[PDB]
Every structure is written in C-alpha cells, then in structure tokens.
Design a protein around this ligand. Structure first.
Ligand SMILES: Nc1ncnc2c1ncn2[C@@H]1O[C@H](COP(=O)(O)OP(=O)(O)CP(=O)(O)O)[C@@H](O)[C@H]1O
Ligand SMILES: Nc1ncnc2c1ncn2[C@@H]1O[C@H](COP(=O)(O)OP(=O)(O)CP(=O)(O)O)[C@@H](O)[C@H]1O
Ligand code: ICS
Ligand code: CLF
Ligand code: SF4
Ligand SMILES: [Fe+2]
Ligand SMILES: [Mg+2]
Ligand SMILES: [Mg+2]
Lengths: 262, 476, 522, 272
C-alpha cells in the first residue's frame, strides 16, 4: 500500500530538484505523496510550495518549548497537486547538531501518525555528505525501503554513490531497506548514460533513468516551481514523467556490492 | 600458593570470549615485592571490555565529582542533560565549612538541564543566559566552573568563548572544563583535564601580586578531598608541627587558597593519581618541590611526619618529635584495645586510584593482612608503588569485573572486603563483612592519629558484628 | 585527641577546641571569606518576596532539580523481568551512576552493564561495542534476556540500536532467538519516568508485534497490570495481594519486587523472580490492561490500545479512598469477580482511621513534590483528609497533567489556596516555603536542605521534611513502605498525623514555658 | 605572524583541489605551510602526498586505543614543497559523528604543538555542509582568522556562499574570524565573473580570483599531484600563482552581510 523512498547522492548533484520534480509528476499522475525534507537548510519542499512553508519541525518545537507540545497541524502543509510537505529544520551552519534534528522530526512524524492517511509514496530528501547516524534516520527499519542514488558521469559523483552504498549495507543487511537504482542527472559528459549503466551493474542495481541537463530546471527553480508546474509541455517536463512512471513500475530492490577503486 | 593463585586466575578467565580473555589476562597478576617495573607484571589505564560490568566512572565524575566539586565558594555548572549532575549531588562527602546557598555551594546541583532544542540548536546562548541568572541569584559566589557532560563535546559548543566573554563582562573567573564523559577510559583523564584547567584559568591570577605574607614554613595539602573531614584531621598535625597550611586541594577548598598556592615552600601530595599533574607543573613553573605522604595509621603517619619535618630546620623537627610524643599514648591504647580483636584477619580491597595501596599500613597496624587489592583506574606508576607494599603471592587486579571479583573472593575467602557502594550489598549477602572505602560508610575521618581511632573501631564493629553469625537458618 | 573509651566521629569531633581554633585560622588567613555580616544579609535577602520574583524569572539556570534522566527508568523497567540484564548502550559513567543511585535507595545490589563507548566509538559509532558487549555479557553473567537502552551520547550521534543488534546476531555474536528488546532513551527528553515508558514499550512490542494473528482478547482470562516507575516494594506487593484476595487472574508486567529484596543467606543472587517471557507473549490474550501510573505510560497505552486492542480503562493511580475504590470496581467490572468482604472491611478501617485523626490533620498546610501520578495521588488524598496542599511542584510535569490537578484542586474547598508548578525545581520551592510558609514538606531526601535553610532563619520558620517519594537516602528501609491502595493510605495517614504530633510535642517540650500543652493524651 | 585560513564552499565546488593547488604555489613561493583536512574522507592532502592519505588522526587513535596514546609523528607527513599534511578522518557515511572527529583532531594538533612551528600558513579544508559546531572548530579563536568561500556562477554555489556567511557572523562577533573573499571556480556560466563580483559586493567582500575550468587540473588529479607540480609551465599553474599572491597580499577582512533569498534571485535575474 504505502511506499517509502529515500533520495541520496553527492552534495550539489540535484537531489532536492530531482526529488521535487519527480513528486510533481507523481502527483500529476494521481498519486498521494508526502515529501519529508532532512536537511537543515530546509529547501526540499520549496518548489512544491511556492515562496514559503515557513514552519520547520525543529523551529516550531524550539518556539513551542518541546517537540511533545507540537501538533501535526503546525508543520505539515500541502502544495502543488496536494503534495504534503514537512521540513525537519535545524540550526544555521556551524552550531548545534543537525543530525539530532532529523532524528527528532522523523520520530515526531511517527509518533503523530503522519504516515497513515492514504499515502502512496513518502519521499525523504537527504543532504549530500551523510556525516552521522542522524542522517540515516530515513533508512532505518520501518522507514524508507527503497533508496535511489543521484549521480552523474564525473569521477566525484560516482565515488559518492559507492560510499553511500557502503553506508547502506549495514542498514540493508540487518533490515529490509534496499537500493532501487541510480538516477543520472546529466552533466553532459561523453558517453555518460553507458558509463552510469556500467557503474549500476557493478553495484548490483540499474540506472532507472537518464535526466538531461536543461536550464529550464534552474529557470523554474528561480520561480519557486517545478518544471512540471512552470512549463508542462517542455521536454524536461516529459523527462520527469518518464522517471515518474518508472519509479512506480520499479521492482528491482537489491543489496548493493561496493567496489574497490581499481 | 603462588602457583595456586595463578591457577585461580586461569580458571576465572575461562568464562570469557577469546578477545575479552586475552585482555582481562593482562590486568590480573600474582605479586612480587621484588619487582620494581610493574609494566613487566601488569598493565593498567586501558579501555574497559564492553558488557563486563566494570565499576569505573567517567571523565566528568573525575573532574566535577572529584577535583572541582569540593571547591566550596565557586559555582560548578553541570552543563548538559539533567542526569549526571543529579546522580552526583552530595554523593561524595567532601566536607566544608560554609553557609550553603549563600557563600558556599558544595551540596547544590547547578545544571543547564538540556532539552532537545538545546541539543539541536546548541546551548551557548543558554549558557550565557545561565551565567547572568547565577550572578543575580548568588551574588557572593567567587567564581563559576562549567563542567561539560557528554553532548557538549559532541555538538561542539564554544564554552571557552562564552567563558572569556561573560567573564570579562562581569570580572569573574569562569572556568570552562571539557570533562565530556566519553573522553578517556575512566575517572583518571577527568583529573587531568581538571588539573590543566586549574592551571590555565585560575593558578596564575596572582603571578604579579606580592602582597601575601610568606614564611619558610608555608605548605599546601594537595590531593585531599576531606572525606568525612580527613583533611581537617591531617591539617591539625601539620600545624601542631609548626608548619602553616596556606592551601588544601580541594576538600574544604576556597578559590583564594588555590591562587595563593604558588607562594608555598613545599607541596604535600596525598593523592598522587589525581594531582601529580599540577604538582609537576608548579615545580616546573614556580620552583616548588613536592612530596608524597601517607597519613593512614600511626606507622605511616609517624614516618610521614618525620620525612616532611626533615625538609625544614631543626625547630620543625623538634616540634615533630613533640607531636609524636603527644599522640603516642592515644594510638597505643587503640592498638591494645582493637588489635587483639583483629589480629590475623584477611582483607581484600578494591578502590579507585590511591587508597588500595595507601591504607595497607593501617590494617597492618591492627594485625590484619591485605591478601588482595586492586584499582579501578591506576596507571603503572601507581602499581610501581603498590607491589612493595603488598606481600608475595597476593592477588592484584585492575578494572576488575563484577564477575572476577565475585569469584576471587569465593576462593580466597577474606574476612573483610573494603570497596565501594556498588560492591557492598553483593558481599553482605554472601556473609562477608564489608566496609565502604570511598565514603568510609558515612563515618571517618580515617586520616592521621584521630582518624585511626575511628578506623580501628569501624573495622572491629563490622567484622565482629553479631549479624554475621546469623546467615544460615538453624533448620536450613 | 581521642579518648579510647569514647571515640568521636567527625560529629562531634570537629567541635573540639583545637579543631575549632584551627578552622578559625584557615578562614581568616587564606579563605578571603565575606564578612559574617554580609553573609547574614545575603541569607536574609534570599528568603524574601523580592528574591522570589527574581528566582521565578529564571529561564536557563536549573538549581536542585527534582528529576533524573530517561535511562534510569529503563534500567528499573528491565530489572522487572526474569533473568534479565539491563544493558545501557553508550558511556560507562552513566551506569556507575545509575547503580549507585539505586544502591543507595534500595540498599541492595543493582545489576547493569555498559558497552563502554569511548572517544573513537563516539566518532565511529558503537557498532563494535554492541557486538563485543552483547557477546561478553551473555557469556559472563548468563542472562535469559538482555534489555538495551541508551545514554545521551549514543542518542546525539543516532546509533541505530535495531541495526546494531541485528548485525550482532547475523554475525554470530549472540544466537538469533536470544531476546534483545530495545528502546531509545534520550536523556535530554522528558525524564526518568519517560525512560520507563519507552523501555516497557520496546519489550512489549518485541514479544507481541509479529504474532498478533493468533491472539484473542480475553482468552487467558487474566488482567494485565503495568505498574510504571515504582520504588516502594510494598506497592508491587499490595496490588498483587488485592487481586489474589478478589480471585482475579492477573499478570504483572515488569515485577522487580523479588530481585530488589533478595535474602542475606550466604549467597549473592544476580537474578530473582520477575515477569516471564511467556507472560509477555501471552499478554495480548488478557481481558484488558490496567496502567497504574497513566501519566507516564502514554506510549505504552497507544501500543496496547492499537496493537493489543484493549479498552485500557481511564483510571487514576489507585491512591487514597476514591481512586482505590474506583480501581477495585473497574477490576471487578473487567473480571467478573465481586469485591470480597475482606477488602470492604479494610476500606472501612481506613475510613475509621480518617475519622480518628481528622481533628489533627484538618487545615494543615503542605508543600510537596515528586513524579506526576504520585503527586496527584498524594494531592487527592490530602484533600480527602481535610488538609490544604499549598505548593505543588512537579518538575517533570506537563501542561495537560497540570490542568487535571488544577481541576481536582478546584473541586474541593480545601484546594482554594493551592497552586501547581511544572518545570520548577527545589530552589523555587525553597522560596515558596519562606514566603508562604506551610507546616510541612512532603518530598524526598533532597528536601532536608530546604529544612536546614528554613531553620537557619529561625526555629519558628522551620518547615519539617516528611520523607515520601524517591530517592530516600538518609533513612533506612523506607523503600519497603506502601503508598497504593488502602494499605498505602493507612501508612501515609499514620506518617502524616504523627509528623504533626511529633512536631507539636517538640514545640511544647519547654519546661514551665510551653509544656502546659505537653499532653499525655492526643 | 602565522596566518590561518579556512576554506569553505558548496559540496563539489572544488575546494580541495583549489586548496591544494593554492598551497603548492605557496610552497613554490617559499612559504612554510600546513594543510588540515576536516572532512571524513581523507582526500584533502592526497595531491600533496602522491597517494591516498591512509593515516588519519581518528584511525590512528582507534588503533592505538585512545588519542592520548597517539604520537604527532604518526599522523604528520610532509609532501611537495615541504608542506605538512594531516587528516582528521572520521566515519564512512551514516554512522557515528564526523563533527566530533574534527573537534578531537584539532584539539590533538593544539596539544601536540602542531602550531608551535615557524609555519607561515595553516589551511583547513572543510566539508561542504557545515551542519554542526564541530565543522566550525576551524574558525574559533586561535584557529582560522581568514575565511575564503569557493563558489561559482551557478545558483547552488551562491546560495551556499550566502548561507555559510550566516554561520560566519556568529563567530566573527565573538572572535577575530573574518571573511577574506570569494574564489570563483568557473562552471562556465555566462557573465560568471561579473556575478560573483556583484555577490561579493552585497556581502561586503571582494572576488579574490577567477579560477578557470581547465581539464589539465583533472589530468594532474589522475596523476595524484597538483598542477603546480604536474605542469609548472602550464597556463593554469600561473592562475594558482596569481591566486596565491592575492591571498598573500590580501588585507580585506570583513564581517559579511548576508542577503535575503529574494535579493539572491533578483541578482541571478539581473545577470542571466
Ligand atoms: N537536470 C538539471 N539540469 C540543469 N540544472 C540542474 C539539473 N538538476 C539540478 N540542477 C541545478 O543544480 C543545482 C542543485 O540542485 P539541488 O539543490 O536539487 O541539488 P542537491 O539537493 O543535491 C544539493 P545538497 O546536497 O546541498 O542538498 C540547482 O541549482 C538545480 O537547479
Ligand atoms: N579548475 C578546475 N578545472 C578542472 N577541474 C577541476 C577544477 N577544480 C576542480 N576540478 C575537479 O573537480 C573535481 C572536484 O574537486 P574537489 O574534490 O576539490 O571538489 P570539492 O572539494 O568541493 C568536493 P567535496 O565536497 O566532496 O569536498 C575534481 O576532479 C577536480 O579535479
Ligand atoms: S581523588 Fe580519587 S575512587 Fe585520589 S577519583 Fe575517587 S577521595 Fe577513591 S581511591 Mo572514590 S584516586 Fe580520592 C578517590 Fe582515590 S572519589 Fe575518592 S574514594 S584518593
Ligand atoms: S558518561 Fe548523564 S547520566 Fe548519562 S544519559 Fe546523559 S544525562 Fe543521563 Fe558521565 S558525563 Fe554524564 S554520567 Fe554519563 S551522560 Fe556522560
Ligand atoms: S556530526 Fe552529526 S551528530 Fe555529530 S554533531 Fe554534527 S550533526 Fe550532530
Ligand atoms: Fe539490603
Ligand atoms: Mg538538497
Ligand atoms: Mg573536499
């Protein structure tokens, strides 16, 4: 009934963009989707909600005194297509502990029953460098069961996909959490789709889709919108629908096999 | 016996998985008083094996509970969640004279009481606000320490900054202490972090000042925390001997005594483990010599009085021989009354870092034998001092496990055990007489001539109590 | 000096002239102490209304709190199950503290392990410590079950207990069927009562979550009893006695009464009695589940209503007459058993005691503190007695609980002068008993410091401490007492009316001044 | 005086590369330099040492038992130009606490007297996202006094440059830490240099230098060395020399003024 997915990938690769554009298409297909942002900058739902969604979970808890005093009504809002949005929140750079903020928010959503409306998909958008246990909260047991790793043809992006896959293994062995595939967000490198297919093969997974580099994405972002909402007829808009259709039909869920760099 | 004890060691160790076995084997030894390099016979100050019920505490207990907490006219903030500060509130009996809540604060629990928002957003703002409320509600406090608990060190709060900023704004010494509980392997590293902080933030305040009037008889007592008044009972002997005690670290201690310690002629170090750090530093920086002494029982005390008095002129030596002559009839009568009741009795000890060797003298003065001893957290230089004090083929244990200690006692069958509150009730149920050797079972002092009297009476009352013959029902 | 025939310990030894003289010199020479004049003026100021206003403006500083952190409760919970070792994943300093804390209250051994996470386990995670630790504990102390909780540091870094344990099993450090229930117990949330709730829920979920398919509610014909964080041995015993007395089949889930009261017979028993694994597995088959202390069993209640499908009754803690009555009728309603003549007579003997002592209890003013259910039970009983609670403090309390207690207070003429405080500590309470003096305090040992303070102002301002609660470290064997049911109510009534009479005799013991009222008959 | 700088910037913007190349050129000028990696992966010193950086402080400490057992000699290595290299280390992704790894490491260097040399420069290479207090350890008192933020003409980098400045302000106030400038690592966005100069202005800083995208950098990277060493004659090698002298001669130190998400967008719109 309910599918929970977590999006990982190298810092700066396009996770929050790709995630939100997918969900837009998914909602446009008639799915009930929740997006859970797990980044202290709280930008993960910024394109589904135009302009603002002022209220992060940690913010409201800090103001309200404690997380226990906070009601579900305060932090969960709906945007384009009825997509439900909630943000973990956390501190500004260089102080406090953003990891614990994620643990607390995910624990809040569970305790308040946020997962049991009539939801088809839950998406956790996680930040790039996964520096601590807090940021693997979305891939614990009874959280996300599918992980998709955003990468590209350059050396650094792939290196990251592999290190995230190692971090997954301890959660995959002891649980049901599985890698769903690699999503290639193009950087226009040579023979790039073939290259990511090869990497996917060595891991034990597939490349679900090749997403072209198209500046409509950034132009829509500047408007606080998804490409789906900003320009439904564009070529990139059909790309996210294709990616969307494939995620619905994916059956491939593996424990990945990390490689040695040679 | 030497071989029998070695056999006892190998049998006990048979229960452990191989990793824990290979390691616990390094921390249990059969003593040789001839050996002077303990590295050869035993190793210590390593991390505890997980899940084996060590009796060890953390760095914060070592720093707040032990070194800082006794200083009576400062306010010590337990910085972090509410537990640590609450389990240590008035648990250690470091006696002091004062008006609690007004000019003295030892039995009080000050904390920042972290909630979840303080973890996630950090607590420097709360800490700053906390220092303002303190200075409002306790205006006679003469300084503040900030004792970090586990999460302050994880999240990277900047308590040094808050201490320099708030301290300047208020012209108050504020000492930030990173005594995060996960640091180190035990209480020991907490001592060290506590001594470096004294050094860095307090000990130098009067480097330029020359107003204090100094005599060739100035000394400091370093490393006595005045348990049940131990330090007050030591201090009186030193002064009857004509010495003047400018400082006591840190039992009944004031922040001004600490600042005046650099003006002394000699540092008298009782607890080597917890304050040898600042003592080496004061010798390096101010030229002050230091020496270890033992005031447990008459023999050690008499020997210590003579050794200390020898560091000064013949007048102090004359007064030494006077003090001795005065208390001679008092400790001899104690011996005549209590030793016949204790002669030949065997005791096993397990304590922290000083007393497992230090108190052996007092037991022998009542005709008792130490058959086993060990420490929670000594370093090899403590075991260097230990082995000549123990008899041959006695058992030595380090960071002993609940299981190991339980089984050693089953075989060795001592008449008395002297250990801590966690040990107490296990061995009473076994029918074995037990004395607390941290808290002195809410009795004491045991230091010096006056303490020895309470020491003799406590060892006899307990060991010879009528309750110990009642453990078996007549009918089974 | 010591006279060998009469050795003096620290008190009164340091009152000898030579020690006193020596301490005078310490103070004058090196202490740089504020003049007595100033100390007395500062002291007096802290007893005023103006200091209270400042004191109650605090936002960041806590002084002398009246609570401890979550894992302390977890440990106590875990202790209540057969051959179970409490295991705290995180820093070992915590465990040394938890054991000492319970050692001192119970005057018993307290068994619990750590997995000794140091600095490298802080930055790498405690996966290895959890592997080696579970293996070492099982091998050395041989429990049937290991119940895992966390220190604050394992919680900051998000150590995934479920995964760490599953990998331990998968890799052969412990056998797969070896029961290892867990609960995240962060110290920077709630308090020690919250830790009990969290631990109980982990264990109950562990034994009943998979296999709800073959469960039928009511099929074992018994009533589940969940006591919560409880530290009076008599409290476990009295619930068990009243149910047996009614003929009710019951199952006490978390029962540490035996293991915290083992006999001194020549052997040490690390384990004794407690709730069996089979009892937990069978629990969803019970008629219903009664929570003794609902205000800290909210997480347990959702799992039991949601997963087990029990109509968990809305019952207050069974303290005092109304709520013991209410407990007994509802147990009667669920099980089919009528209330036996023996309990009915006991009820009337507590009523008889209330009638006998009412003239001395009437209008007496109390300040009190403790855990949420304890406090509200104690408040309800003080009102039934004709007493006036004045200062009600519950440091680990919440806004909803405070609302309920304010309603009980307002339902009675005797609550007109009372105010409830949540989030406030013993330094706050100290101000209250100086500015609005009650006759007595009812709280734990930490209250002796308040009593010392009130006395220093003057013998007419002294507010005596009545020791009921947790922890009690300065009296012996009060942990064997009872506070629940009729039996608890008789004990509390007797403790209260006799504190009142003990104090009155002290105020009337002055020869030819106050002793005209030193009556033989009260 | 010894100058301490901390390099920040968006994930993937090229910090480590720019830092090591900047440092090689500094060593090439005859400066005495130390590099401190504050990233759990050990790649901050890999182009200076000619192989991966195998021995991080945390790893060596875990092996020795505790950091208290650890020697400075066991973790401090010298590479190209005599440049001193040390790595914090930390966990692989998703477990433990990389923040504490940095806090532990910096404290170790201080205790072992790592700064008590005649060093001319210390550079801290820091993680992309500054998620906690530990990753701001490099900018406390007695640590970095100069911060450089590596960015690009791309949206993500400028948002990140602005967000990091928010974090900087808190430390600038209680300490001496100052924003020194922006290093623009080109992504070939149109009118890229003008945009970063403009962004620099609203914050109160300069754009210190424009580093072109040059595939020679990646060729040297495959050879596990800096461009300064890989090809001393190359045009790119000159770009790093330029950047070096500008940081060396830099005196502009400001507390930045962070702008609002609106201003940042109107700026992108004004140039693109
Ligand atoms: N297919 C595409 N074509 C062109 N630009 C794209 C793109 N996908 C993403 N981008 C741009 O790249 C930038 C990064 O996108 P996004 O913010 O989603 O990355 P991310 O979430 O991986 C960074 P972090 O790890 O810090 O959360 C954005 O400016 C975005 O508009
Ligand atoms: N000026 C330039 N020209 C060409 N390639 C460059 C370059 N600067 C960096 N690169 C390449 O881009 C890749 C990323 O470099 P680098 O590792 O320094 O980025 P970074 O440190 O911000 C990533 P992280 O956030 O994981 O630390 C490397 O392959 C590097 O060689
Ligand atoms: S300080 Fe140490 S454990 Fe030297 S931490 Fe511990 S009041 Fe012990 S053996 Mo408790 S090194 Fe003091 C000690 Fe000895 S607290 Fe007391 S009794 S002489
Ligand atoms: S080693 Fe503290 S008791 Fe713990 S779960 Fe945190 S609040 Fe409770 Fe030492 S510094 Fe303290 S006592 Fe431990 S936490 Fe660390
Ligand atoms: S690394 Fe993760 S856990 Fe450690 S402090 Fe930073 S955010 Fe909190
Ligand atoms: Fe007992
Ligand atoms: Mg993102
Ligand atoms: Mg880098």
């Amino acid at each position: 009934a309910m599918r929970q997915c977590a999006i990982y990938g190298k810092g700066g690769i396009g996770k929050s963009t790709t995630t939100q554009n997918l969900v837009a298409a998914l909602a446009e297909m008639g799915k009930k989707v929740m997006i859970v942002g797990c980044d202290p900058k709280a930008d993960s739902t910024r394109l589904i909600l135009h302009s603002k969604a002022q209220n992060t979970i940690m913010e409201m808890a800090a103001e309200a005194g404690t997380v226990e005093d906070l009601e579900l009504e305060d932090v969960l809002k709906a945007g384009y297509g009825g997509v439900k949005c909630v943000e973990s929140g956390g501190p500004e750079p260089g102080v406090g502990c953003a990891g614990r903020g994620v643990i607390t928010a995910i624990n809040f959503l569970e305790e308040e029953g946020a997962y049991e409306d009539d939801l088809d998909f839950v998406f956790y958008d996680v930040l790039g460098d996964v520096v601590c246990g807090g940021f693997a909260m979305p891939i614990r047991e009874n959280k996300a069961q599918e992980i998709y790793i955003v990468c590209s043809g350059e050396m650094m992006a792939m290196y990251a996909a592999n290190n995230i896959s190692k971090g997954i293994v301890k959660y995959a062995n002891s649980g049901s959490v599985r890698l769903g595939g690699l999503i290639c967000n193009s950087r226009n490198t040579d023979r790039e789709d073939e290259l990511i297919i090869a990497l996917a093969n060595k891991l034990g997974t597939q490349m679900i889709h090749f997403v072209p580099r198209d500046n409509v994405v950034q132009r829509a972002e500047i408007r606080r919108m998804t490409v789906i909402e900003y320009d439904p007829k564009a070529k990139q808009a059909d790309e996210y629908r294709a990616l969307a259709r494939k995620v619905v039909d994916n059956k491939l869920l593996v424990i990945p096999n990390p490689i040695t760099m040679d | 016996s030497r071989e029998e004890v070695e056999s006892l060691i190998q049998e006990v160790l048979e229960v452990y998985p191989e990793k824990a076995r290979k390691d616990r084997n390094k921390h249990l030894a059969v003593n040789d008083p001839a050996v002077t390099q303990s590295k050869k016979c035993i190793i210590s100050n390593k991390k505890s094996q997980p899940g084996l019920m060590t009796i060890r505490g953390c760095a914060y207990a070592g720093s707040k509970g032990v070194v800082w907490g006794p200083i009576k006219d400062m306010i010590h903030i337990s910085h972090g969640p509410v537990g640590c500060g609450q389990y240590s509130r008035a648990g250690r009996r470091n006696y002091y004279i004062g008006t609690t809540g007004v000019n003295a604060f030892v039995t009080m629990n000050f904390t920042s009481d972290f909630q979840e928002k303080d973890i996630v957003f950090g607590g420097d703002k709360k800490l700053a606000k906390l220092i303002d409320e303190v200075e409002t509600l306790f205006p006679l406090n003469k300084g503040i320490s900030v004792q970090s608990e586990c999460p302050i060190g994880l999240i990277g709060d900047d308590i040094e900054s808050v201490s320099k900023v708030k301290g300047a704004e208020l012209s108050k010494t504020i000492v930030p202490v990173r005594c995060e509980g996960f640091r180190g392997v035990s209480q020991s590293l907490g001592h060290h972090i506590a001594n470096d902080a004294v050094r860095d933030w307090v000990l130098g305040k009067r480097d330029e000042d020359t107003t204090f009037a100094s005599t060739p008889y100035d000394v400091a007592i370093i490393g006595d925390y005045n348990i049940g008044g131990d330090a007050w009972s030591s201090r009186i002997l030193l002064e009857e001997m004509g010495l003047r005690c400018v400082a006591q670290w840190s039992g009944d201690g004031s922040i001004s005594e600490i600042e005046l310690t650099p003006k002394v002629k000699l540092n008298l170090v009782h607890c080597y483990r917890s304050m040898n750090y600042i003592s080496r530093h004061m010798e390096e920086k101010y030229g002050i010599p230091w020496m270890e002494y033992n005031f447990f029982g008459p023999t050690k005390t008499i020997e210590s009085l003579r050794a200390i008095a020898a560091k000064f002129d013949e007048s102090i030596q004359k007064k030494c021989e006077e003090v001795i002559a005065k208390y001679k009839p008092e400790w001899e009568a104690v011996v005549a009354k209590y030793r016949p009741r204790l002669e030949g009795k065997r005791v096993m000890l397990y304590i922290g870092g000083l007393r497992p060797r230090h108190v052996i003298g007092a037991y022998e003065d009542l005709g008792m034998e130490v058959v086993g001893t060990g420490y929670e957290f000594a370093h090899n230089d403590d075991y260097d001092r230990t082995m000549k004090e123990m008899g041959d083929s006695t058992l030595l244990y380090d960071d002993v496990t609940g299981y190991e200690f339980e089984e050693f006692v089953k075989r060795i069958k001592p008449d008395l055990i002297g250990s801590g509150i966690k040990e107490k009730f296990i061995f009473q149920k076994m029918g074995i007489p037990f004395r607390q050797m941290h808290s002195w079972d809410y009795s004491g002092p045991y230091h010096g001539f006056d303490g020895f009297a309470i020491f003799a009476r406590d060892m006899d009352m307990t060991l010879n109590n009528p309750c110990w013959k009642k453990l078996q029902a007549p009918w089974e | 000096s010591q006279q060998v025939d009469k050795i003096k310990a620290s008190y009164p030894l340091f009152l000898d002239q030579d020690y006193k003289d020596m301490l005078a010199k310490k103070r004058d020479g090196f202490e740089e102490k504020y003049p007595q004049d100033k100390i007395d003026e500062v002291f007096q100021w802290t007893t005023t209304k103006e200091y209270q206003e400042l004191n109650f403006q605090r936002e960041a500083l806590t002084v002398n709190p009246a609570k401890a952190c979550q894992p302390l409760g977890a440990v106590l919970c875990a202790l209540g199950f057969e051959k179970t070792m409490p295991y705290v994943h995180g820093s070992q300093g915590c465990v040394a503290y938890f054991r000492s804390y319970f050692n001192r209250h119970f005057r018993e051994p307290v068994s619990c392990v750590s997995d000794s996470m140091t600095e490298d386990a802080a930055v790498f995670g405690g996966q290895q410590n959890m592997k080696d630790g579970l293996q070492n504990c099982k091998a050395t102390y041989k429990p049937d079950m290991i119940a895992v909780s966390t220190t604050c540091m394992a919680e900051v870094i998000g150590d995934d207990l479920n995964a760490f344990i599953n990998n331990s099993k998968k890799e052969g450090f412990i056998p797969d069927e070896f029961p290892v229930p867990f609960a995240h117990t962060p110290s920077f949330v709630g308090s020690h009562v919250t830790g009990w709730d969290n631990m109980f829920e982990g264990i109950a979920r562990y034994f009943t979550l998979k296999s709800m398919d073959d469960k039928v509610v009511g099929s074992n014909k018994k009533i589940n009893i969940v006591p919560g964080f409880e530290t009076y041995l008599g409290n476990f015993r009295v619930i068990k006695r009243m149910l047996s007395e009614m003929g009710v089949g019951y199952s006490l889930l978390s029962d540490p009464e035996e293991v915290l009261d083992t006999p001194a017979d020549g052997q040490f028993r690390m384990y004794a009695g407690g709730t069996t694994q089979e009892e937990m597995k069978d629990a969803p088959n019970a008629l219903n589940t009664v929570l003794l202390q609902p205000w800290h069993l909210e997480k347990t209640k959702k799992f039991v209503e949601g997963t087990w499908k029990h109509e968990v009754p809305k019952l207050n803690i069974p303290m005092g007459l109304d709520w013991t009555d209410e407990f007994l009728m509802k147990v009667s309603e669920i099980s089919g058993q009528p209330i036996p003549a023996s309990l009915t007579k006991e009820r009337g003997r507590l009523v008889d005691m209330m009638t006998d002592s009412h003239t001395w209890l009437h209008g007496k003013r109390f300040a009190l503190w403790g855990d949420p259910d304890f406090v509200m039970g104690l408040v309800k009983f003080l009102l039934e007695l004709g007493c006036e609670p004045v200062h009600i403090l519950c440091h680990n309390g919440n806004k909803r609980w405070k609302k309920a207690v304010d309603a009980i207070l307002a339902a009675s003429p005797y609550g007109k002068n009372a105010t409830v405080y949540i989030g406030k500590d013993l330094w706050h309470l100290r101000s209250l008993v100086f500015t609005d003096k009650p006759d007595f305090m009812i709280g734990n040992s930490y209250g002796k410091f308040i009593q010392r303070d009130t006395l220093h102002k003057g013998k007419e301002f002294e507010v005596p401490l009545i020791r009921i609660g947790f922890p009690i470290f300065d009296r012996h064997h009060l942990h064997r007492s009872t506070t629940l049911g009729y039996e608890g109510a008789m004990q509390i009534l007797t403790t209260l009316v006799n504190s009142i009479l003990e104090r009155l005799d002290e105020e009337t013991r002055g020869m030819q001044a106050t002793d005209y009222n030193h009556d033989l008959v009260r």
